[PDB]
Amino acid sequence: EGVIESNWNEIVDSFDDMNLSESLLRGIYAYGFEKPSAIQQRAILPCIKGYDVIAQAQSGTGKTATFAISILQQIELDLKATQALVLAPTRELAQQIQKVVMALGDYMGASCHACIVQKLAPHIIVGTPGRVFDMLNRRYLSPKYIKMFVLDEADEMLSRGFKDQIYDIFQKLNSNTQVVLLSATMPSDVLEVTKKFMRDPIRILVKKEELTLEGIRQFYINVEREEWKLDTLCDLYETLTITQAVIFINTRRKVDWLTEKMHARDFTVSAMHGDMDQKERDVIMREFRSGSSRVLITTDIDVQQVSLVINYDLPTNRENYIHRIGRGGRFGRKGVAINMVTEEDKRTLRDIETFYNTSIEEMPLNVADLI
């Protein structure tokens, strides 16, 4: 799910027309192997030609034959040295790679060892970054004939803190080393690795939405009229047990208004808006994180946990809706959001689920026994 964006057009959907060697194909057909993904279908060819490649492949590509093929087709089978080096974030992923690489490899007489002792020079080495850096360091492996460096799941590896080890390993490799990075995610630092290590590489990216609504319970209250919002907001603090909350407001004027009325009801509050510099926000975020204020009121945030988010004002568009309550990452997919709805909102937006493209349900009475 998503859409491919490439700077290179060179597709192949079969093992048949990849210009592979015979012993490789003997291996491919021997073990009925799967078809390659759309991503892989456009990476495999320039990859075989030795070009630098950035492929936004889904996690687990290391298990597949196309992955193995991209490595085996480049190996001088008669040179008895390590020519390819694959880094994976964990033992299980390295073993999966080792398994499929050595399966196909056997028909070709290629060797593949997974670094995860005395025996150590196989053509291909796959393993964890630290373990692998260590082996180069203690000279049990040689970067001398290594012409290919694969970073499978670069994102996972950076997340698991192997950036250091990865940069140190790179410094030991020849200048003409083909780099192939695979990552389902392309955050800033992953992009940096490629800028640092690659020369005009093939780019096969997938534009992916970074914030998501997944697992966030979304409610709305028919407040009907603007002037009944303050009361509605105060009743929520009597219906629910709220530790800290973020209240989004559309204008600086109302931010100031709401913090005055809220403060008059003995809420500790922090107000923030666009006509404030970064040094003034910092002090305000400092007070919210510390819990000196139980309520943060802003316009269109640096904090890890809050009881819920309240859209006191409905956001002007979907992008804003997602920047307000959407969360990044695969885990900790929980949250509670409450939207306040007036008749004018309903008359303008027509249908909020459609307008904001998500599932928002009317806040029930038993809401406290639900979130």
Binding site: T90, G130, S159, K163, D164, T243, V303, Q305, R327
Partner: protein, 209 residues
């Protein structure tokens, strides 16, 4: 005199010295990172800007990342006296293995979930069921047990905590003392202001599964 020495000093002597971090740091993966330390209020700001009386430094950095765990690998812990920092704890947790990794876990990530993601790490795979490791663990007090209680997975002293009633912030830091060896420190920021630095202790923990 150098901002790096003063922090190191404040941590060891148990003095009060607050740390500010640029959100931009969280775009930098866990590892060895060159930063600039600047005086800010009576504390120190850490960022990537060379100006405003910025003194360079080389530290061990560990970012925060929403919906995820970030990890600092033991193989990075080697230069004696190097400082270590992780982004502000405002609900999140920090788990540290002695001779092992440091994990910054996002707040709502359930304990069952992050434990499973941690176990994937090499150091955890070597931690045989039925044996011990030394662990420094810190969560916000009053937070729901679903987000941090690891009693089904470990037998040992209770984790350290910060704040009260799931309110408060913490700043975790360190000083490398040797190869895969680091002294951890913490200070809290609540409605009473900021406390002084105190050791973040490692206790013995037995792996139950």
């Amino acid at each position: 005199n150098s901002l790096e020495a003063q922090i190191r000093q404040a941590m060891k002597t148990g003095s009060t010295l607050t740390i500010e971090f640029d959100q931009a740091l969280n775009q930098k993966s866990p590892g060895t990172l060159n930063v600039f330390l600047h005086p800010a209020n009576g504390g120190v700001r850490i960022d990537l800007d060379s100006g405003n009386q910025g003194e360079p430094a080389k530290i061990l950095w560990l970012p925060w990342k929403q919906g995820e765990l970030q990890t600092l690998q033991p193989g990075s812990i080697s230069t004696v006296d190097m400082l270590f920092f992780t982004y502000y704890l405002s609900g999140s947790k920090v788990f540290a293995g002695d001779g092992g990794p440091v994990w910054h876990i996002d707040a709502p990530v359930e304990a069952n979930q992050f434990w499973r993601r941690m176990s994937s790490d090499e150091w955890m795979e070597d931690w045989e069921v039925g044996t011990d490791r030394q662990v420094a663990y810190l969560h916000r007090a009053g937070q729901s047990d679903s987000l941090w209680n690891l009693s089904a997975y470990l037998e040992g002293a209770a984790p350290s905590t910060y704040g009260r009633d799931n309110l408060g912030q913490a700043v975790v830091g360190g000083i490398v003392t040797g190869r895969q060896q680091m002294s951890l420190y913490q200070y809290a920021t609540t409605s009473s202001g900021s406390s002084a630095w105190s050791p973040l202790t490692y206790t013995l923990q037995q792996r139950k599964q």
